[PDB]
Structures are given as C-alpha cells and as structure tokens.
Structure 1
Amino acid sequence: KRIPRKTKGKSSPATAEPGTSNCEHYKARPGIASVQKATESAELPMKNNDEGTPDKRGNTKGALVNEHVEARDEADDATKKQAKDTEKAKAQVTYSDTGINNANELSRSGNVDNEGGSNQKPMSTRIAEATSAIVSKHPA
C-alpha cells in the first residue's frame, strides 16, 4: 500500500433480528442537508496572504504598488466579493468607505523588500549588477 502524494516534491444459522428496520420515518427540522452546506462553507480554511514574501531566488513576490493604495484596492475588492456573495447589486456590509478615517492603514505588497528598500529593480538583478563590477578578464 502506497499513499499517493498531495503536492509536488523536490524531485519533480442466521435470522434478521426483530429490531432492525431499513425505512426512515423522521425528517429533521433543521435540515441535515442545509446545515451541511453551510458548514462546509465555514469549514473552508483561511486564505493564504503570500504578498511580500521572498521567492526561491530572493525576489519578493507581489505587485509594485503603494502600500496604502494596495490596502484600499483590496478593501474595494472585499466589498465587491461581499456583494457577489450576497447576490445583490449593493452590499450592506462594506469594508470600504466605512466612515472612519483610516489613512494610515498599510498592507503588504511587492513594493518594499526585507531590507526596507524599493523593489524597482528585482533583487537578483541588483546583486548581479553589483558583482559584475568586480569581474576581471584574461590578460590581453
């Protein structure tokens, strides 16, 4: 018995007793079906927020955008998703335009690095350009 792997790895006589019955007679008021569907919906686990973390080569993952702008944009996206889930054109619960002045909110993006510097040039290219200056070549 080999259990298959979930994610890719590095390499890649007898008589029927008088009590038993096989016919249902009860229908649940809080329906079994209804509850299950909601439960499996709540049971869905947390969403991964991979923004800002470095990659295998060291380049930070994400999009180049201002921090507060990214926070506002994802708040708007959350409002749109709430409206879509509520299946109404206007959402009662809004995570955006709350009315509380929240202008200091910051949310992770790809603009900043772990060294607190901009990511205009991806890190791997920065290290490559630094090392290049040092190289020397065979004598003419």
Structure 2
Amino acid sequence: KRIPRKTKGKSSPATAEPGTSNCEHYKARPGIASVQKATESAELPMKNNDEGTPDKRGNTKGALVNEHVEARDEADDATKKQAKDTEKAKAQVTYSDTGINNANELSRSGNVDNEGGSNQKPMSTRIAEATSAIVSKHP
C-alpha cells in the first residue's frame, strides 16, 4: 500500500525442540563477505552514455569538444580511473598510448546535431532567429 516513486511525475507441550541448538563451528572457506564485496561491484549496473543526445529542449547536451579529441581523452579518463581502482600510479591496463593506430576514431560528441551540422549555436536559438526573420509590427 502507498508505494513511493523515485522519479518526478508530470509537473512535479508447546515446544521441546529436538531440532536446533545452534552453535557455529564452520568457516566459509572462500568467505561470504569477500564474494559479497565483489558481487556488489558486479551488481553495479551499466553506466549511461548521455552524450550527443537531444535534451528536453532539443539541443544536443554534449560539451563543445572535437570528437576524435574526446575519443582519445576518454581513454585517458578511464585510464586514470583504472589507476585509481588498481591503486597504483600507472594504470597497467591502459586504454590509450598503444602501438595500434586509431586515427579514424569517432565518439558521440556534442559538436554535431542530428542533421549533421555544427552546434556552435543552439538549435532552439537558431529556430528563434529563423522565425524572428519574419515578423510585422503595427501600422
């Protein structure tokens, strides 16, 4: 009854017991808590990729970056997080600086809209000037 919702909606002779007398004398040989610690991390779901997508307004909510430059930089970002989660200074499993050329790499940057053009101005903006190009005042 009455379940709360996380996301915004709209505007927003009795017993002699021969059974158990418990006393723990067994150790979990891998360990329960270790598998709990690992399986919580595995329980963490997939991280969203918000980038390059239209927002509620329409404008693509990605930052002003070059797409190959961001695609090279995201390897550095996940590499630094890899070094943080291995807790060593050099991330041994790195995602960049290999010998394998990836110059045609492209990621989903906010430089591009859905039509395939630049996103220097917002598109709600450029439609606002598109209709401001035709008005007529009082005679």
Q: Counterparts of 2:106 and 2:136 in 1: how far apart (Å)?
A: 45
Task: List runs of 5+ in structure 1 lacking aligned partners.
Answer: none
Please, which moves more after superposition, 43-52 or 1-10?
1-10
Would you say 1:5 and 2:9 are equivalent positions?
A: no
1:25 Cα deviation (Å)?
A: 1.3
Identity rate of aligned residues, in percent?
100
Residue 13 of structure 1, CA deviation: 2.9
Gaps of at least 5 residues in structure 2 are none
C-alpha distance 70-16 of structure 1, shift in aligned 2 (>3 A) = farther
* Post-superposition offset of 1:46: 0.3
Calculate the TM-score normalised by the size of structure 2.
Answer: 0.96
Indicate how the Cα distance of structure 1 residues 16 and 25 shifts in structure 2: closer, same or farther if over 3 A, else same: farther
Shift of 1:16: 3.6
Shift of 1:117: 0.4
3-state secondary structure, aligned to 1:81: helix
CA distance in 2 between counterparts of 1:7 and 1:26 reads: 45
Q: What is the rounded CA distance, in whole Å, between the counterparts of 2:131 and 2:61 in structure 1?
A: 23
The alignment partner of 1:134 has SS state of coil
Q: What does residue 95 of structure 1 align with?
A: 95
Q: Detail structure 1 runs of 4+ shifted over 3 Å in the superposition.
A: none
Q: Determine the C-alpha separation between the residues in 2 that align with 1:122 and 1:21.
A: 72
- What SS does the aligned partner of 2:4 have? coil
Distance of 1:75 and 1:48 partners within structure 2: 16
Displacement of 1:138: 1.2
**Paired residues for 1:71-110 under 5 Å:** 71-110=71-110
For these two proteins, the number of residue pairs brought into alignment is: 139
Per-residue deviation, residues 28-87 of structure 1 (Å, max 9, x unmatched):
110000011000101100000010110111111110111100101111001100000000
User: 1: distance between equivalents of 2:16 and 2:126?
Assistant: 79
Moved more, 10-19 or 87-96: 10-19
TM-score where L is the length of structure 1: 0.96
C-alpha RMSD over aligned residues: 0.9
